[PDB]
Write a protein that binds this ligand. Structure first.
Ligand SMILES: Nc1ncnc2c1ncn2[C@@H]1O[C@H](C[C@@H](N)CC[C@H](N)C(=O)O)[C@@H](O)[C@H]1O
Ligand SMILES: *Cc1c(COP(=O)(O)O)cnc(C)c1O
Ligand SMILES: *Cc1c(COP(=O)(O)O)cnc(C)c1O
Lengths: 421, 415
């Protein structure tokens, strides 16, 4: 039962974080209880805890789903055994994802689901007698995880491939996909892919929204082009929807904006409503059959299809489906847009953009976290900028007033960027 | 929306990838409730659910730790925030692991914790101004996970194509200082290219359930120190008492520079792993250029998983675990002894709460599985191995039942 000061002391001495942290002591609905100057303060989780908390924290339905599962069985090995939570979740996922995806492979994290997607693609072509088809192609600006293979398709400059390469698989990169639709971009993409088609297993991209590579949006029409290009050159298409899934862009999955189905698909983050790590890789029947007809995909992972994480996800997915989630996301998008409009006129702001429940203020310099953090906290909001971006991905349960409280703090952070000393 | 066992099977058959499965409907203590010919039957979890359920399933103390935490905070992002379950767990881990390991990096799986270890080692030598130290060295027979980097040090045969590391021969069971000398000679040839030696200490698990004399770890520690190569121990399988020491490293009295834990860390409730390093590794990386070891992972240091793990570790430490494992080891030895005289049995071996019958041919799972279930035991052999890694809470009578089923499966492989 440590005190905030003891927590801070232990953390300073023994904990590695990604990249002095604030002590969080509670989380309920859209709100976190954080320790500031030795006192608890309530702040909005404008980040959704890294895009996971779509229904808020401590939602009664998700809490209960977990406690109910905990009562009957915490976990059994998925080697030789199956269970209801995996079965229910698999059925839900195949039903709500783009058409053709009827096979589900569970893992424990988004990056591992991407590795699984890559193994599927490589084993697919090997089972066709084409093992030379082993490279991946993507466009720049992407992010697909922190493992070595996932790093090989992350943006090469944002990912510092230069001090990670000769250790990274050498992949094929098209230029940054532009925001607005330009048929010349897709034509150049096809021409590059065509040169490598015989060594390419798959194209892998984040559809519509590129998250951790810079919160960039692109016209859904580009996905239509990639689908067609991949089909003609016999290259699989992989959509990484670990960030875009479960309504976040205003459609259930961002692929839906283009009306295209990839051959393989990854989901994670919002999958469990931000309770527990879980991810999934889906593929088509043709992909699954070719692999399984081939000469023997994974030995684990150990916690594959964990009943607890699967049960809460079922509850989270059913909670989303059982409400008018589309209207809800449309309203949040409208709130973000109206709330961020004022930021456009600010001196250090280069762009303001919104896609579904994603709100972005792009600035003309890197955001100084030692300035941004306390300023947002002074305004009752937890914001975590990265690079030159002040952005939010709020819980879907945020009220119109909470949304404007978030956007108001974002504008205020940008203003300080901003000016200055 | 509330499935019958027949419906679970139909849904699984149509839409689930596994690594025809048996439907599990419950688990409590050392027992699983499985569906066999329509009927819910209880069987022993002789595998501890892939080596994770050390206190058994649904342990009141661990269940309670989870229900307590859920009421307060399910999860927050570990980017810019910290919390009590993370602090409590990092503190326990630093205290109970080999001396010198004082920094903890949490992740969601063992295979990821191994990639994190590799990233620490690579960034370490860059921070020392030695960026040519980039390759890994291991010995044959190992397993480190299913991710791409992790697979690069898994046993080459059995598991560009695709990250070419340095491999010493299979480490022998008995101690032969000549093995260690040849290991040193090979390492010396590559020392300037090598970031780290990575091995499983004492027990190699998914690569063949092979044991080796702890003195080899002693030698590796000295070899590594003399040649400026980091030593990494992957204790994802061996951790938390499984081999009769708290950590397998303890059988040799050595500390690695970096260490990985997972599996039994949470008592098998939830996926969590961790990578620990020394203060010299942490400071040398953090004073180094890039920043960004990870972004990464989204669910890093999950309050729920950390909380249950605290309860699990405290449960283990709060008892005479050492005596418990000794009793388990003794029970496994007595129960498997019989099997050595069987036509198909090459070896019988026990190390802590790990019991192994090695056969002269593959075990048929279509024969082995139903045979042990009829005996009230869930056993999953692999390759030529019939083995168990049972919960620590298994009674002598449960151990005899497990070992009896094991001998019978071995007796059948020969038939
Ligand atoms: N001043 C800064 N400069 C660079 N990066 C920063 C800064 N402040 C924050 N960030 C952190 O960098 C992290 C990078 C994130 N976009 C990671 C994305 C994603 N949620 C993931 O973890 O996979 C953000 O979560 C921020 O917390
Ligand atoms: C979050 C992210 C990942 C990585 O997920 P982790 O669980 O953190 O490993 C992969 N792809 C995309 C698009 C992501 O946003
Ligand atoms: C279990 C295992 C791993 C992999 O852990 P996962 O959680 O399955 O990814 C890594 N190293 C060793 C020694 C293992 O036994």
């Amino acid at each position: 039962g440590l005190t905030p000061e003891q927590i801070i002391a232990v953390d300073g001495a023994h904990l590695w974080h990604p990249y002095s942290p604030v002590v969080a002591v509670a989380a309920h609905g859209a709100w976190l209880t954080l320790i500031r100057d030795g006192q608890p303060i309530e702040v909005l989780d404008a980040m959704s805890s890294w895009w996971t908390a779509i229904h808020g924290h401590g939602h009664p339905a998700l809490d209960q789903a977990l406690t109910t599962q905990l009562r009957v069985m915490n976990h059994v090995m998925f080697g030789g055994l199956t269970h209801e939570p995996a079965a229910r979740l698999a059925k839900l996922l195949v039903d709500i994802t783009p058409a053709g995806l009827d096979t589900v492979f569970f893992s424990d994290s988004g990056s591992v689901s991407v590795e699984v997607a890559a193994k599927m693609a490589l084993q697919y072509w090997r089972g066709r007698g084409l093992p030379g088809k082993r490279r991946l192609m993507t466009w720049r600006g992407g992010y697909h995880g922190d493992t070595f293979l996932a790093m090989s398709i992350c943006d090469p400059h944002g990912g510092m491939h230069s001090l990670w390469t000769d250790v990274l698989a050498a992949q094929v990169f098209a230029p940054q996909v532009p925001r607005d639709y330009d048929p010349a971009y897709s034509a150049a993409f096809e021409a590059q892919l065509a040169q490598h088609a015989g060594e390419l297993a798959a194209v892998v991209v984040e559809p519509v929204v590129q998250g951790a590579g810079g919160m960039r949006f692109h016209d859904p029409r580009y996905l239509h082009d990639l689908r067609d290009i991949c089909r003609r050159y016999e290259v699989l298409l992989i959509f990484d929807e670990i960030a875009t899934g479960f309504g976040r862009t205003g459609a259930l999955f961002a692929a839906d904006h283009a009306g295209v189905s990839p051959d393989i698909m990854c989901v994670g983050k919002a999958l469990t409503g931000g309770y527990l790590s879980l991810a999934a890789t889906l593929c088509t029947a043709d992909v699954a059959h070719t692999i399984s007809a081939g000469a023997a995909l994974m030995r684990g992972p150990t916690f594959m299809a964990n009943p607890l994480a699967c049960a809460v996800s079922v509850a989270s997915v059913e909670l989303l489906l059982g409400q008018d989630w589309r209207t809800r996301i449309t309203e949040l998008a409208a709130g973000l847009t109206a709330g961020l409009d004022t930021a456009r006129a600010l001196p250090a702001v280069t762009d303001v953009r919104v896609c579904g429940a994603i709100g972005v203020i792009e600035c003309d310099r890197p955001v100084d976290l030692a300035v941004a953090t306390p300023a947002a906290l002074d305004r009752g909001v937890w914001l975590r900028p990265f690079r030159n971006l002040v952005y939010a991905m709020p819980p879907y349960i945020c009220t119109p007033a909470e949304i404007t409280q978030i956007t108001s703090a974002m504008v205020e952070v940008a203003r300080l960027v901003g000016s200055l000393p």
